Amino acid sequence: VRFPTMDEYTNAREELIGSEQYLRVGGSINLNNKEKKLNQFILREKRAIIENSRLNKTQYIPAVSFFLSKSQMESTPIFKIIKDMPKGAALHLHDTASARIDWIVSNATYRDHVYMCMDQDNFVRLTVSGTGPPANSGCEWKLVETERANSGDIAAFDHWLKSNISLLTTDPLVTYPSLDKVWGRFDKHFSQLRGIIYHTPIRRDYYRQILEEFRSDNVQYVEVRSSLSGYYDLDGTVHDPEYGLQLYKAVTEEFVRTYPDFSGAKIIKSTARVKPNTDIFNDVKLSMDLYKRYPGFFLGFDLVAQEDPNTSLLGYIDSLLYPSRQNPPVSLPYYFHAGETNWQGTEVDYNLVDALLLNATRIGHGFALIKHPRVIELVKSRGVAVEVNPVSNQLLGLVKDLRNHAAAPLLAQNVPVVISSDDPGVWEALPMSHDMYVAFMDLVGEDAGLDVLKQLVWNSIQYSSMNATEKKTALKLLQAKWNNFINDSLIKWKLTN
Amino acid sequence: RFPTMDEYTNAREELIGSEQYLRVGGSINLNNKEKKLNQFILREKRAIIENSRLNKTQYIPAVSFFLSKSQMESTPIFKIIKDMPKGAALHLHDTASARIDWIVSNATYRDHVYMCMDQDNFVRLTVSGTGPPANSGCEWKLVETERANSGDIAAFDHWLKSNISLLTTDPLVTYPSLDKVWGRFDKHFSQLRGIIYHTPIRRDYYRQILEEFRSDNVQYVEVRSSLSGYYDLDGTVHDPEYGLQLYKAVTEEFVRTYPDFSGAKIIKSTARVKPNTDIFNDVKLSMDLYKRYPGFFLGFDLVAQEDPNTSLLGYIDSLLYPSRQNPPVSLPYYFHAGETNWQGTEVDYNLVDALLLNATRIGHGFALIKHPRVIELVKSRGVAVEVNPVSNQLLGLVKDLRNHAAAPLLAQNVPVVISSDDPGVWEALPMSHDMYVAFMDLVGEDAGLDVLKQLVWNSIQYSSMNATEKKTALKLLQAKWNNFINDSLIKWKLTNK
Numbered sequence: 001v002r003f004p005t006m007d008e009y010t011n012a013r014e015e016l017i018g019s020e021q022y023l024r025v026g027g028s029i030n031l032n033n034k035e036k037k038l039n040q041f042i043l044r045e046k047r048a049i050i051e052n053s054r055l056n057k058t059q060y061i062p063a064v065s066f067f068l069s070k071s072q073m074e075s076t077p078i079f080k081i082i083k084d085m086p087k088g089a090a091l092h093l094h095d096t097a098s099a100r101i102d103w104i105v106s107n108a109t110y111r112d113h114v115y116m117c118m119d120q121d122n123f124v125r126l127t128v129s130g131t132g133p134p135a136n137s138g139c140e141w142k143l144v145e146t147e148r149a150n151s152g153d154i155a156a157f158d159h160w161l162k163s164n165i166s167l168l169t170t171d172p173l174v175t176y177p178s179l180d181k182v183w184g185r186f187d188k189h190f191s192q193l194r195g196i197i198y199h200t201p202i203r204r205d206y207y208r209q210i211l212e213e214f215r216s217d218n219v220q221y222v223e224v225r226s227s228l229s230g231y232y233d234l235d236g237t238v239h240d241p242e243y244g245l246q247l248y249k250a251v252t253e254e255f256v257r258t259y260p261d262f263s264g265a266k267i268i269k270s271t272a273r274v275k276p277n278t279d280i281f282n283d284v285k286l287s288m289d290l291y292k293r294y295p296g297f298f299l300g301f302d303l304v305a306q307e308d309p310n311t312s313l314l315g316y317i318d319s320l321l322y323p324s325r326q327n328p329p330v331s332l333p334y335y336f337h338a339g340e341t342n343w344q345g346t347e348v349d350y351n352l353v354d355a356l357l358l359n360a361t362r363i364g365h366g367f368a369l370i371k372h373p374r375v376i377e378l379v380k381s382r383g384v385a386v387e388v389n390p391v392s393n394q395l396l397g398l399v400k401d402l403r404n405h406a407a408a409p410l411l412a413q414n415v416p417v418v419i420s421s422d423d424p425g426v427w428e429a430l431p432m433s434h435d436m437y438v439a440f441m442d443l444v445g446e447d448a449g450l451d452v453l454k455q456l457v458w459n460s461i462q463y464s465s466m467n468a469t470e471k472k473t474a475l476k477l478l479q480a481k482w483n484n485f486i487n488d489s490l491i492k493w494k495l496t497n
Numbered sequence: 498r499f500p501t502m503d504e505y506t507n508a509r510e511e512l513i514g515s516e517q518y519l520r521v522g523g524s525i526n527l528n529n530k531e532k533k534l535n536q537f538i539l540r541e542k543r544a545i546i547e548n549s550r551l552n553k554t555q556y557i558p559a560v561s562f563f564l565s566k567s568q569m570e571s572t573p574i575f576k577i578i579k580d581m582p583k584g585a586a587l588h589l590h591d592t593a594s595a596r597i598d599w600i601v602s603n604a605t606y607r608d609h610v611y612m613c614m615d616q617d618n619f620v621r622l623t624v625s626g627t628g629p630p631a632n633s634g635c636e637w638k639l640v641e642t643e644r645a646n647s648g649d650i651a652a653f654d655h656w657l658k659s660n661i662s663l664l665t666t667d668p669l670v671t672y673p674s675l676d677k678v679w680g681r682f683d684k685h686f687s688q689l690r691g692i693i694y695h696t697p698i699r700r701d702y703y704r705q706i707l708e709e710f711r712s713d714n715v716q717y718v719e720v721r722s723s724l725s726g727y728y729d730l731d732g733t734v735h736d737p738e739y740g741l742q743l744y745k746a747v748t749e750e751f752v753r754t755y756p757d758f759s760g761a762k763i764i765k766s767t768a769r770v771k772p773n774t775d776i777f778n779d780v781k782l783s784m785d786l787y788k789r790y791p792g793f794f795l796g797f798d799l800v801a802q803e804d805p806n807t808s809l810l811g812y813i814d815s816l817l818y819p820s821r822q823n824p825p826v827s828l829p830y831y832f833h834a835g836e837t838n839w840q841g842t843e844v845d846y847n848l849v850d851a852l853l854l855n856a857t858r859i860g861h862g863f864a865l866i867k868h869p870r871v872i873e874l875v876k877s878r879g880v881a882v883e884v885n886p887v888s889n890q891l892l893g894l895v896k897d898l899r900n901h902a903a904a905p906l907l908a909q910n911v912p913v914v915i916s917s918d919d920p921g922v923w924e925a926l927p928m929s930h931d932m933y934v935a936f937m938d939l940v941g942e943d944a945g946l947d948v949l950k951q952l953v954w955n956s957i958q959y960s961s962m963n964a965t966e967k968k969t970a971l972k973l974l975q976a977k978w979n980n981f982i983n984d985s986l987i988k989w990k991l992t993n994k
């Protein structure tokens with residue numbers, strides 16, 4: 001008889017469950033006594049919300065649309081703890097989508113020579129024109145200063161601007177109920193802001209706001225995708241990508257000199273995968289040059305824009321292999337978005353295969369990765385972190401209930417993962433706290449606590465592209481922040497026994 | 498590493514080929530005729546996926562069954578799967594596996610059938626030979642009278658069907674939460690309970706399961722049944738052994754009539770809402786029926802909604818009782834387990850207990866991909882997972898079926914059988930709808946006839962037939978398969994004339 005007594009059965013059961021706990025993200029962390037006090041509180045709070053949803057037969061709010069869950073999570077202790085927690089790094093961000101729309105309205109649209117129009121889809125667009133009103137080809141441009149002053153209600157005018165640009169004005173899962181409809185709205189958002197956010201002094205100040213906002217959410221480091229190109233002055237001068245990089249380098253250096261508690265930022269050049277192979281070839285050659293001349297600030301290259309309907313990595317493969325085929329070879333790092341899809345066995349999810357054959361340093365999303373066991377082996381073996389952006393994947397159509405997020409089985413296998421926010425400004429998310437809350441409540445289990453959070457935070461620095469010296473310094477800083485956070489939390493939640 | 502495209506191509510195809518060999522069916526070698534059909538299926542699959550992907554429209558095989566049912570039935574892939582022999586349906590509930598149309602057109606035309614509108618405004622049906630039933634919470638009326646006075650009998654009969662089926666409206670819209678749709682599902686069983694437990698109707702309903710499954714080219718079924726409480730017009734209530742004998746006699750007559758049908762076996766099910774003291778008696782009952790009906794009675798299962806009700810651990814002394822006897826008794830178990838979106842809770846840890854108790858097959862295992870050690874145990878022991886994709890969508894575990902959690906199981910060749918669960922409740926065919934959605938949503942664009950063939954063979958190889966029965970059934974399946982291949986080449990004009 002295998003299990004003659006309850007003790008024989010529970011021994012076997014607990015060993016099996018415990019063995020799985022040891023294998024998931026964070027499973028090897030040993031919390032100290034102060035961390036354990038906070039962990040026990042976090043776990044009591046987590047069990048209360050889950051058991052209420054399960055036994056009282058009501059929806060699990062952390063997993064529903066961000067439109068519905070945002071205001072509900074923000075009043076809760078677990079969210080308030082994650083808000084205070086140091087996050088380490090946000091490694092997957094886009095530079096035109098990472099600061100508040102409120103700042104675009106309250107700051108940028110109060111500058112001279114900003115114009116607005118309603119396009120033929122009934123969306124507001126914003127741009128800058130130094131010479132005069134822009135040509136009235138597809139819409140009638142009007143000076144924002146005049147429209148605001150004539151609105152008869154300035155606060156309502158500004159709120160309307162914000163409402164007409166944000167993807168969280170209504171629930172995207174209701175208003176744009178298909179992949180194509182919501183990506184239509186997402187694409188439109190960037191068209192709405194493109195003119196104003198490419199004007200050089202606004203773009204400079206917007207990048208500074210990214211750093212300020214991320215610091216204010218207790219993020220100490222960011223790596224940012226940027227096209228770098230086409231920043232334009234009031235007189236019409238258009239700058240090249242190297243200028244865009246130098247501009248970001250100077251903002252970043254000023255910021256880190258102001259805030260020693262902040263580790264800094266580095267940049268990845270992104271190009272939209274709707275362009276011909278000759279454009280990607282030129283941007284690859286550009287990236288080779290910037291990688292050589294800005295070591296330690298310019299990281300490498302990525303291809304962006306919607307993955308499903310546009311060009312695969314294989315479609316650009318001669319361009320992407322060009323660095324490695326030089327004599328001597330040139331090693332241009334790649335940070336490919338890859339597998340941001342529900343498709344299986346197609347040109348889209350097979351981008352994961354090409355991303356690994358091209359030696360990607362990290363991969364963006366990897367939503368399809370759990371369908372590719374041989375790619376998982378390579379990702380684990382090589383230490384290629386997967387940048388998981390859970391709110392983005394829900395709102396942009398890959399999943400509805402976030403407990404079905406395809407990164408939950410990755411985390412259960414200890415695939416290297418970092419959490420990030422992707423385009424938080426587009427849908428009114430915080431730099432990291434909302435995405436970290438939904439990862440913690442939806443993508444790991446009821447009995448997963450502070451150890452998961454600590455591991456994800458440490459991962460974001462460990463799998464950053466900092467050099468060894470920078471990384472050692474950043475981890476010492478993170479450890480200090482973490483200690484202060486534990487001590488402060490014990491006092492705040494009245495856990496000091 | 499890749500000086501030319503040929504070297505890059507070779508590495509890419511080696512990695513993709515490794516994944517294709519690993520997944521379900523990857524080791525099958527198709528013959529020349531099967532390859533011709535395979536090439537047509539793959540051409541059809543690529544055309545529909547590429548149209549969805551490149552023309553930016555929804556992928557109909559993955560949307561709500563309410564919307565996709567009428568669309569898939571006109572397509573060649575569906576028609577091929579319809580004609581295909583399925584082998585076995587191994588996961589079925591006996592009060593939910595024949596057509597509601599038969600309940601209406603046959604059962605509700607029988608003498609002594611009554612109907613009433615309950616307090617939730619649903620029709621309920623029952624039989625009473627000894628006068629009309631007492632007006633306890635509803636007012637019973639003879640159906641024969643209600644029908645004859647309707648003024649439109651076609652509309653009356655259609656109203657009955659529409660008031661009972663869960664596919665009258667889209668459940669994802671009408672009942673848009675787990676608790677709401679399970680409320681509707683539970684209500685469906687309440688609507689039919691009275692009529693479907695009347696002995697001659699139950700007998701004839703079970704015969705209709707066999708007729709309908711045979712007509713969808715299924716040759717064998719294993720069926721969960723509560724067995725107990727069938728009642729006669731004079732009020733006699735029968736015991737579970739009688740219910741088992743009733744099904745045994747129907748099955749034997751069916752196989753005499755149709756030697757091209759392999760037959761059926763029965764699993765006793767009990768609802769997991771009962772006190773542990775009552776489950777103990779159902780385990781003892783199952784031990785006795787297993788001893789005395791070897792080869793027809795298979796074992797035991799616990800059913801009803803998994804999330805809010807009792808876990809396997811809550812019944813553990815009852816479930817361990819057979820193994821603890823002197824001498825031990827090996828009562829086989831077929832546990833529904835992990836039919837849930839929860840992680841790290843009592844519900845998904847039912848999978849651990851299912852394995853410790855040596856389950857022969859596991860029902861659903863939706864949460865299994867979150868449990869890497871349980872997966873390895875399932876693979877090494879050959880415990881088949883019964884995957885019921887339409888059920889999991891309509892009853893609230895997933896919306897886009899390409900997010901179904903069995904797709905990563907099939908990619909690692911976890912042993913899986915496809916089944917339909919409760920097809921009569923939502924107007925599905927015995928197997929062809931579930932096999933179509935598994936084929937179109939749970940494996941990739943490059944997965945063809947080898948996946949179908951493997952899942953069909955799996956349904957016999959992981960059945961509970963003894964070894965001699967399996968060999969007989971596989972010879973019968975092979976002949977059906979060969980006829981299906983030849984017929985398909987002629988029907989789809991593939992013979993290369």
Ligand SMILES: *[C@@H]1O[C@H](CO)[C@@H](O[C@@H]2O[C@H](CO)[C@@H](O)[C@H](O)[C@H]2NC(C)=O)[C@H](O)[C@H]1NC(C)=O
Binds near residue numbers: 164
């Ligand atoms: C962007 O703003 C426009 C202009 O206000 C909105 O269009 C209006 O939408 C309302 C609904 O509240 C319609 O009844 C009106 O007819 C529209 N007015 C005009 C002048 O066209 C539009 O809905 C906003 N779009 C978004 C996504 O918020």
Ligand SMILES: *[C@@H]1O[C@H](CO)[C@@H](O[C@@H]2O[C@H](CO)[C@@H](O)[C@H](O)[C@H]2NC(C)=O)[C@H](O)[C@H]1NC(C)=O
Binds near residue numbers: 661
């Ligand atoms: C089952 O049948 C009842 C009775 O016909 C339906 O009741 C009707 O419900 C609609 C609302 O959807 C009302 O407008 C009607 O007045 C109701 N009629 C009566 C006589 O009450 C009920 O909707 C049906 N339920 C389902 C799920 O189909």
Ligand SMILES: *[C@@H]1O[C@H](CO)[C@@H](O)[C@H](O)[C@H]1NC(C)=O
Binds near residue numbers: 048
């Ligand atoms: C269910 O809700 C009630 C209040 O409506 C509360 O008393 C009870 O604790 C809840 N159960 C759980 C497990 O949260």
Ligand SMILES: *[C@@H]1O[C@H](CO)[C@@H](O)[C@H](O)[C@H]1NC(C)=O
Binds near residue numbers: 106107108110205
């Ligand atoms: C906008 O930000 C710039 C740069 O920080 C600042 O100088 C200016 O005062 C701001 N405008 C408003 C209206 O606050």
Ligand SMILES: *[C@@H]1O[C@H](CO)[C@@H](O)[C@H](O)[C@H]1NC(C)=O
Binds near residue numbers: 324359
């Ligand atoms: C990828 O990395 C390996 C090991 O460092 C190297 O030998 C190979 O050339 C690289 N391949 C490419 C395509 O850069």
Ligand SMILES: *[C@@H]1O[C@H](CO)[C@@H](O)[C@H](O)[C@H]1NC(C)=O
Binds near residue numbers: 544547
């Ligand atoms: C997209 O639709 C057009 C017009 O119906 C059709 O010609 C084209 O072949 C479709 N594309 C694909 C890839 O199916």
Ligand SMILES: *[C@@H]1O[C@H](CO)[C@@H](O)[C@H](O)[C@H]1NC(C)=O
Binds near residue numbers: 602603604606701
């Ligand atoms: C119902 O089925 C029974 C038993 O198979 C059959 O004898 C009877 O004719 C059927 N009733 C109708 C209305 O078809």
Ligand SMILES: *[C@@H]1O[C@H](CO)[C@@H](O)[C@H](O)[C@H]1NC(C)=O
Binds near residue numbers: 001002003853854855
């Ligand atoms: C499970 O099976 C093993 C191997 O057949 C056997 O030794 C063991 O006693 C069984 N356990 C239970 C709980 O029935």
Ligand SMILES: [Zn+2]
Binds near residue numbers: 092422
């Ligand atoms: Zn991104």
Ligand SMILES: [Zn+2]
Binds near residue numbers: 588590860918
């Ligand atoms: Zn079932």
